[PDB]
Structures are given as C-alpha cells and as structure tokens.
Amino acid sequence: RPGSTKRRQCYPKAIPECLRESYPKPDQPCYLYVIGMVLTTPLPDELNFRRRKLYPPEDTTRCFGILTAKPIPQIPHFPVYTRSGEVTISIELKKSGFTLSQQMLELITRLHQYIFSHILRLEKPALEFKPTGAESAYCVLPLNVVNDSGTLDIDFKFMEDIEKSEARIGIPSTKYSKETPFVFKLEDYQDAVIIPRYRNFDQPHRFYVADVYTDLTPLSKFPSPEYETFAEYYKTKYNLDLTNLNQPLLDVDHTSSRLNLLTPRHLVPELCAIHPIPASLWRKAVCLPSILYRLHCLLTAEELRAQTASDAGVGVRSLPLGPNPGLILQALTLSNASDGFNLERLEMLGDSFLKHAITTYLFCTYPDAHEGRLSYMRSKKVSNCNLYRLGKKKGLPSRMVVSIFDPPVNWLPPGYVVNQDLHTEQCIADKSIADCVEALLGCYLTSCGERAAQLFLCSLGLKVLAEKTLNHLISGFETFEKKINYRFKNKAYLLQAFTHASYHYNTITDCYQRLEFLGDAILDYLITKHLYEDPRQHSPGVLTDLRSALVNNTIFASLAVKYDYHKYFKAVSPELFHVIDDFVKFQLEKIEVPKAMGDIFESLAGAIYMDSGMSLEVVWQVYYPMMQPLIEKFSANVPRSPVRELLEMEPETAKFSPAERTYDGKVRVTVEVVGKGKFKGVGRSYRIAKSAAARRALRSLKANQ
RNA sequence: UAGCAGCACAUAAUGGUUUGUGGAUGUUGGGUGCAGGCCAUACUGUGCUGCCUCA
C-alpha cells in the first residue's frame, strides 16, 4: 500500500541550485570562497595512538578556496573530526564579480581534476571528469597568504609550479650519481608529501614528513626487522646504491584513506620524490569530501528553509527568521545514515501537533458532525499514505539523507559524471517520506512556533486554517470552577462537557463527545510538547513510552475522580452511576474503569479551549497542575506492563496459556512459573486476563522473596 | 597506502513471531491495514581481531 514500509521506490539525489551548473566561464564574473578551518577540540593523546603532533589547520598560510559562477549562501559553521580532533569549518566569501582568463581557468580546472583523481584517488573506471557536463560543477583551488599580510589570494605561482613539476604525472626519473650526488635541503621537507621511487609503481604510497631526523642516516638501523640498515635495505630490495650515505632520514606517516570525517571515531630522502603539494595543504585536501558533502547537505537544507519561507511565509527568504538549517538537516536524516542525529524526536512532536491542528480544523469546519465521523475523517488525513503523497509532492525524497556517507562508493565529486547507481540514486520506503513530513513539522514548531507550523501545514496542502435552563443545570458548578481554579465565560461549554448522551434533560447543548474529540488531541499534544521540552531530554523510545503511559483514558479517569468531576457528571443510566461509584470507591481506597470519566476529562479540556478563545496555554495552565504529579512520577520511573515485568523477572520459567473463553464470555489465562506455581487471571479481554494472571504471579514471587 | 575471513555493534531489505490498534459478512471473537518488541535469510559501515600484500 502507498505509505507502507513494504513499498520502496528509487529517487535521484538533489543537488543545490547554487552548485548546479556552477562552472566558471572565461572572462565572466565568478565568486571565490575561503574554506576557514579552526581546531576547536583537540584529540586526547590516549586516542592519538602514535602520540603524533596535532596539526591545527589554522597554523599554516596555505588553504583551499571554492571557485564558482553562482554565489554560496551563509551556512552554519560545522565540525569535522580529523586525526587532530574536532575542526570547526567556515565558508567565507573572499572575492566577488572578478574575471579569470582561459589559461588561469585551465590551470585551476587541471589542478582541480588532479586533486580528486591523483591526490584523493576518487576517480574510478565508472567515473569521468567532465566539468562542463557535470551536474555539480565547481572548482577547488589553493589560496595563500600574500607577503605575510594575513590576506589570502589565489596561489597561481604554486599552481604553475605543480604543472612544471615532472612529479605530477608519475615518479620522477632523476637518478643521482657520483658526478651529481644528492643534496638534502631541509626547507624542501619540513612540510612535504613524499613518494618512494623504487616500489608500488601502479599505486605509489604517499607519506607526510612528520619529522626530519638529522641524527639518523642511511647507515642507521632499519624499521622492518628484515634488514640491518636503510642502505642494506635499498641495495637488497631494489639494487640501489646511495650517493649520500650521510643524508638525514625522514619520519613519515601514511596519507589517510578514511575520507568520511562527519562523526567522531570514539625513509631516505634521495630515494623519495617530493610531491609539489605541501603536507599541510594535503591534510586540508583529505577533508574536502566530508566538507563538500556537508556543504552540499546544508545547502539543500537551507534551500528547503528558503523555499518554505517563500511558500508558507514562515521566516525570511535570505538571512541578515525561520529554523536553523542544521535542524532541517536533522529532519531530513534517517537513523540509517548514522550521522550522530536523526528525525525521530522531531517526528513524534510533529505527529502530536498534526493531530491537534487537524482535529481543531475538523471540529470548527464541521460543527454538526458527530465524534465517530470527525475521528474517521481525522484518521484519513493523518495517515502515513496521505503524508507520503504530501512529502513526495514537496520533493523531500531526493533531499533525504538515507545512507552512510562513503566517498569512493556513494559520492560523485564536483566536475565528474557517471559512465552509463549508488552515486546518483537512493532507495526509500514510502513510510520514511511520511515520517520526514512530521519531523519537518516538529522542526518548524520547535523553532518558529505553532502558527508557523500551521502555515507550514497549509503550504504542504493540508487545510488547517435556554439561559434559565443553563443556570438550572449548572447549579453548584461554582465549587468545581474554584477547584479547577478556572471560571467559564460561557457555562454552556461546562454543561456540555459534563452531559452524557443518556441525559435527555439537556436540550440546550450537545453531549460531551465532540469536546472529548477536541480535548483528546489537545492533551496528546500538550503532554508530548512538555515531554519533548523536558530538561531530562528523553530518548525517542522513552518519549514513546511516556506518551503512551500519560495519554491514556485510565489516567484521565483517575484524575477526573481526584478532581471531583464525577460529582458534576450529568447522566441517566443507573448502571453507569454504580460503575462510577465502585471506581470512585476503589480510587478513594488506594474493577471496570468507567470510559465516561476519562472522556469528560478530555471534554473539559475541549470546553476550556473553546471558552478561552482557542488558548492552548489557558488549557495547559488548568491541566498542567493536575497532571504535574503523574508527569513527574512517570518521567522519574518510566512505567511497565505486568506481563513484561514477569517475563523480565522469569524469562525461561514464565509461560502463558492460550486464551480460554469462559461460560460468561470473559477470557481466562493461566501463567505457569516453572518451580514456582500456576496463577489464573480473568477479564473481558486476553490482556486484562493475562495481566491479572501476571500480577498474581508477580505478587506470589515478591511475597516468597 | 592495499585485499580478504572471523567476532561486537548500528543499520535498512524479504520472510515469520509477538503487544497495541482500526472500521469490517462482523450468527456469540478468524479478513485485512499501520506501529512498536523478538526469530530467521541476506546488505553495508565502523570497530575488536585473524590471515595475507609493501615497508
């Protein structure tokens, strides 16, 4: 069925408007952004297993810049988890409206290809570099501080030096001889990436110079137990005789193969070619996939924020407000993506508000429709099927973050195309599209409030925007008004809330059921909002349990009794009065729970809402003090099913019998606890019977301890 | 800077199981829809390893 977990559809991945077809043209205006990088949380030495120097990206003059034909909007700064620790990333506009020659652009584009294909090794047989044909079409280039002025500019000299370098295309063929002996220059290695010239020619291993040992030489002990010295090693393995046996040695670290950095984890110089790119900049380059991917994701969320400000009139289209793009990114992220956050908290809050909004709308739009009809209409509008259709219509599937980020397996680099797919497409369940709509609603609600959330629903396509008899029938309710600490402006709502369908003496208002319908959704929402805003920051699972335990007719009935609602209840059913008196007796001492007592509790919430001029706050002011003791009790001690508690205490020993229908229509259930006895429970339903059996077993077990 | 095979965990897919829930021919409750918790087949990622490339 549409909106079901069992139905899956494939969708193309969305690329932000500011990155789509964004390739700089010769002699045309372009934009240059600096990738600002700051080490905000250094990695502890215990996690840094080699205890290597942490390299704050900010300690070095060279960085990367993004060159694009279209402007990039302001995005929140975001963390990246490097081997140095948490690095906060900023994307900062450095130059706008400037032009580049064909030769300058060719140098930039060639170096851009060189980064992704040669440095990062992301170009695969399935991928082709087509910068003019690629959907995501921007260039990345080196920036450097000009003359120590602290001002960053395009390092053209360095790009040209990379082009003149033979080391660009492969391993340099410069073999040293006794006539042309190798000369070590320290300045050339302090911030160098090196390539060993005698091995692994198809995939040359690259290393960062971590340090230069001036005390160690080719005659010193080799790190592999296979050889006595560095000179013996090269002579034995590659037949290479060194010209300079007194040259210093390089301490080196492998260039990182891990390109996903979005979450926390917790040699002889003469025989090496110097890669023309410095090690500092190469460390920055390794972050480009996570940075660009995150940038792309945040730009998609900002695009959705801006689109919603245009379509719903919620927030401002361009920031100097609407929700933070990071919260939108949360609402667009499935738990499968493993990105440190998920849509589940926002989804649950949205659902509760959605119910409230539709319930209110239906109640006001259909003044003559009975509860069962409003409940039926409600059930259709809030369905996972309808929500899926709305999310699909809004283009959410192409914007959702569904799978774990893996650059060489599921990411397309800028300027590349796929040779005709984990790079361009994703498979999504219809239910997940529905869940995302509720999470977006929760985002707008938490960030911009209820009116904004309603305007957001309207933007998705959900339309969400006698007197003598009265005085006689309300006689004595003044004590009730004082007990609840609320005075009704229109006592007809109070009368309606306490009028059962059997109470035909009331010919001036309806029965309580319509207000029950309205109140149910109000209480669910208010309770859910409160639980979501709770300082304990309950998990999605715990929020579900607490919502289930607090939003319950039994609890509403228990409160109705404690607050004397039963004394004001108007009914003409002696049996109902006896059931209420028996339940009231049971509640006063500490057995069927009278449904009507929970219903009138909800109906009075509906009454107060209508009498207060649709003020949820007034309703909450009245109900929160009544519910606060229970909210505190269950949020301190998250509740349990007696069947589950018995199964937790006795998992292999407690076995329940099938449902036995007794001669009176009532169900009987027996629980056998191996070595501890058999306990029988009876009730009008299998759980009432099974729970009664489980409670009898639990009582016996606890009494024998 | 490489590949593979075990173990932990997360995770979606296709089956089953179990709690909640719905209007339904509802002769007095087994027809189907959606959620949770489990069992199985099979996917990916990180990590604890193990073998195994270069050093």
Numbering used by the authors: 739 to 1004, 1033 to 1086, 1290 to 1389, 1543 to 1587, 1649 to 1773, 1796 to 1910
What does the paper say about this structure?
Vertebrate genomes carry a single highly conserved Dicer (Dicer-1) gene (Jia et al., 2017), which encodes a ∼220 kDa multidomain protein that appears dedicated to the miRNA pathway. Cryoelectron microscopy (cryo-EM) of human Dicer revealed a protein architecture that resembles the letter “L,” with a complex helicase domain at the base, tandem RNase III domains in the core, and Piwi/Argonaute/Zwille (PAZ)-platform domains at the cap (Lau et al., 2009, 2012; Taylor et al., 2013; Liu et al., 2018). During miRNA biogenesis, the PAZ domain, which has a strong affinity for substrates with blunt-ends or short 3′ protruding overhangs (Lingel et al., 2003; Song et al., 2003; Yan et al., 2003), binds the base of a pre-miRNA stem loop and the two RNase III domains function as catalytic “half sites,” each cleaving one strand of the double-stranded substrate (Zhang et al., 2004). The helicase domain, which has a clamp-like architecture of the RIG-I family of RNA helicases (Fairman-Williams et al., 2010), is located near RNase III domains and is composed of three globular subdomains: an N-terminal DExD/H subdomain (HEL1), which is separated by an insertion subdomain (HEL2i) from a helicase superfamily C-terminal subdomain (HEL2).
To this end, we reconstituted the ternary complex between Dicer, pre-miR-15a, and TARBP2 by direct mixing and omitting size exclusion chromatography to preclude selection of a given state and to preserve the conformational diversity of the sample. Cryo-EM analysis of the ternary complex revealed the co-existence of two states that resembled the pre-cleavage and cleavage states based on the 2D class averages and 3D classification. A minor population of about 15% of particles in our cryo-EM data resembled the cleavage state that we observed for DicerO. Using these particles, we determined the 5.91-Å-resolution cryo-EM structure of the Dicer•pre-miR-15a•TABRP2 complex. Overall, the structure of the Dicer•pre-miR-15a•TABRP2 complex in the cleavage state is strikingly similar to the structure of DicerO•pre-miR-15a complex; the dsRBD of Dicer interacts via its α-helical face and clamps pre-miRNA in the positively charged groove formed by the RNase IIIa/b domains. Notably, the structure of this ternary complex lacks not only the helicase and DUF283 domains but no density was also found for TARBP2. Furthermore, the binding register of TARBP2 dsRBD2 of the pre-cleavage state is incompatible with the RNA-binding register of Dicer dsRBD. This implies that TARBP2 binding may promote unlocking the closed state of Dicer, an effect similar to the removal of HEL1. Subsequent accommodation of pre-miRNA in the dicing state may dismantle TARBP2-RNA interactions. TARBP2 is able to shift the equilibrium from the closed toward the open state of Dicer as suggested by capturing the cleavage state in the presence of TARBP2 but not in its absence.
